[PDB]
Amino acid sequence: AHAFWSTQPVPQTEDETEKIVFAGPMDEPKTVADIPEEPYPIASTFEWWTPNMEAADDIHAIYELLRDNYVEDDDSMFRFNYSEEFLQWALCPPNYIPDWHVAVRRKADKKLLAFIAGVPVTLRMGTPKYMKVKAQEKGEGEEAAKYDEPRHICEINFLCVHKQLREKRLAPILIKEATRRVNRTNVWQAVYTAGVLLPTPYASGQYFHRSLNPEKLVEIRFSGIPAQYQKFQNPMAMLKRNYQLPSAPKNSGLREMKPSDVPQVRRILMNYLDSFDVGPVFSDAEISHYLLPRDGVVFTYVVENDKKVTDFFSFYRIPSTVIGNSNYNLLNAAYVHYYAATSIPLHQLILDLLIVAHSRGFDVCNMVEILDNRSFVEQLKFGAGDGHLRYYFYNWAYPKIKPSQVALVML
Ligand SMILES: CCCCCCCCCCCCCC(=O)SCCNC(=O)CCNC(=O)[C@H](O)C(C)(C)COP(=O)(O)OP(=O)(O)OC[C@H]1O[C@@H](n2cnc3c(N)ncnc32)[C@H](O)[C@@H]1OP(=O)(O)O
Numbered sequence: 001a002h003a004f005w006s007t008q009p010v011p012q013t014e015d016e017t018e019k020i021v022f023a024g025p026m027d028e029p030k031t032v033a034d035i036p037e038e039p040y041p042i043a044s045t046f047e048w049w050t051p052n053m054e055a056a057d058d059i060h061a062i063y064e065l066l067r068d069n070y071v072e073d074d075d076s077m078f079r080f081n082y083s084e085e086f087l088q089w090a091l092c093p094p095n096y097i098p099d100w101h102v103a104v105r106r107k108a109d110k111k112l113l114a115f116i117a118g119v120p121v122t123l124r125m126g127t128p129k130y131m132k133v134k135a136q137e138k139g140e141g142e143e144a145a146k147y148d149e150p151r152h153i154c155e156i157n158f159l160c161v162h163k164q165l166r167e168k169r170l171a172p173i174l175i176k177e178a179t180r181r182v183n184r185t186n187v188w189q190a191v192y193t194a195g196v197l198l199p200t201p202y203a204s205g206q207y208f209h210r211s212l213n214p215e216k217l218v219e220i221r222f223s224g225i226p227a228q229y230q231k232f233q234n235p236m237a238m239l240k241r242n243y244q245l246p247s248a249p250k251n252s253g254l255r256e257m258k259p260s261d262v263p264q265v266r267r268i269l270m271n272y273l274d275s276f277d278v279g280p281v282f283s284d285a286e287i288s289h290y291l292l293p294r295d296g297v298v299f300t301y302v303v304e305n306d307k308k309v310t311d312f313f314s315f316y317r318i319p320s321t322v323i324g325n326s327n328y329n330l331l332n333a334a335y336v337h338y339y340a341a342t343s344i345p346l347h348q349l350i351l352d353l354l355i356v357a358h359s360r361g362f363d364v365c366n367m368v369e370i371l372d373n374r375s376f377v378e379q380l381k382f383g384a385g386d387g388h389l390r391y392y393f394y395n396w397a398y399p400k401i402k403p404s405q406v407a408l409v410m411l
């Protein structure tokens with residue numbers, strides 16, 4: 001049933017994942033010297049290409065491939081349209097490895113046909129709390145703790161095959177070449193997410209949406225006006241009032257994050273993230289890169305009242321092309337990114353996220369039920385969607401965990 005995934009070092013069934021007790025590698029250890037030095041073979045009409053993410057033009061070629069051929073729902077309503085500014089941000093964090101950006105082009109016209117990207121991440125991925133308890137009970141602490149140290153691994157994202165080349169087994173060849181390039185840098189694990197079920201997730205969570213511009217959403221969504229608004233005389237007026245937000249933030253002291261905030265944001269975020277079983281560790285340079293505001297891409301506010309930063313939140317922008325509409329070309333979504341609250345309740349911090357996003361002309365705020373996101377779903381009027389984000393590791397055995405034990409946000 002999986003001609004490619006059956007050949008890879010990943011858990012092969014749900015049952016296998018539910019029986020794993022300790023974190024650790026799937027494969028026995030290899031060295032960089034064991035790994036082929038030459039690119040994986042490809043058909044003579046194609047060639048491997050390493051785009052330069054410094055170069056505006058190479059970013060633009062990747063942007064167009066993804067604009068026309070990236071993730072689209074099963075009803076062909078929406079397709080993500082990550083901006084060029086976003087792809088530069090995502091693809092070039094501190095100490096990124098250019099070789100981990102892997103593309104296929106047609107040899108004749110140099111048309112870009114496929115892409116996949118890896119970036120570095122430092123991840124806590126040792127045995128989860130509930131499994132460490134089971135291990136202490138049985139005198140197996142030392143085994144359970146062996147891979148507790150944060151590991152410098154690869155995060156994979158942006159896998160894409162052009163629509164004309166679908167179902168030709170090109171995605172496996174991109175996955176193999178990316179694995180080769182990562183392994184030749186002495187990295188042996190990756191983390192990735194997908195909205196589809198593959199073998200085999202260690203965690204899965206539903207997506208949640210909070211309408212910010214419900215009229216637009218009703219024009220473009222399959223279901224809007226949501227049917228349960230039909231018992232009213234004016235369904236649309238009741239829908240608008242349901243989702244209405246204040247026009248200005250409520251936390252006194254909220255302001256945009258600035259470079260001097262980096263060390264305090266790093267500290268409050270690290271203290272919060274360290275409570276979860278799977279989560280990143282960020283250097284000051286990675287806090288600066290992923291959290292300082294960047295126009296049209298990432299938006300980050302701190303609560304500082306008395307010249308001390310006690311709270312912050314961030315969101316990032318992913319527009320989608322709206323495939324079948326007269327009125328609207330684009331859906332402007334704000335996705336909840338990292339946050340930390342030490343002085344106000346999390347729901348009060350995130351309400352100011354919604355207030356800012358709405359003031360800036362976003363249509364919807366999205367998130368997955370990771371972190372403590374479930375804590376404010378009902379009061380802030382998020383609704384579950386149809387989708388699930390599934391979290392995976394490559395070459396890492398890991399017990400099944402709840403998505404409220406995952407602290408890694410995927411872009
Ligand atoms: C140590 C370092 C390791 C680094 C590598 C770590 C692994 C990284 C893994 C990648 C994480 C990516 C994270 C993201 O970016 S998730 C976003 C994925 N992108 C899209 O959904 C964009 C639109 N769709 C497409 O571009 C294509 O349909 C793709 C490229 C998805 C498949 O192309 P195509 O439809 O033309 O099919 P094929 O004939 O070439 O290939 C068929 C094989 O592909 C398997 N498949 C289908 N979807 C996915 C998927 N989302 N992750 C992994 N595998 C996938 C499928 O099970 C089958 O294998 P098997 O069932 O027969 O065995």
Ligand SMILES: CCSc1c(C(=O)N2CCOCC2)cnc2ccc(OCc3ccccc3)cc12
Pocket residue numbers: 071072073074078079080194195207209217221320331333364366385387388389
């Ligand atoms: C985030 C999953 S839903 C989705 C949106 C989205 O934000 N929506 C659509 C429903 O109206 C408001 C919220 C926007 N553009 C998309 C583009 C592709 C797509 O493919 C399905 C998918 C399912 C799970 C995870 C990722 C993608 C879904 C969406």
Ligand SMILES: [Mg+2]
Pocket residue numbers: 161165166167168169170171
């Ligand atoms: Mg293919």
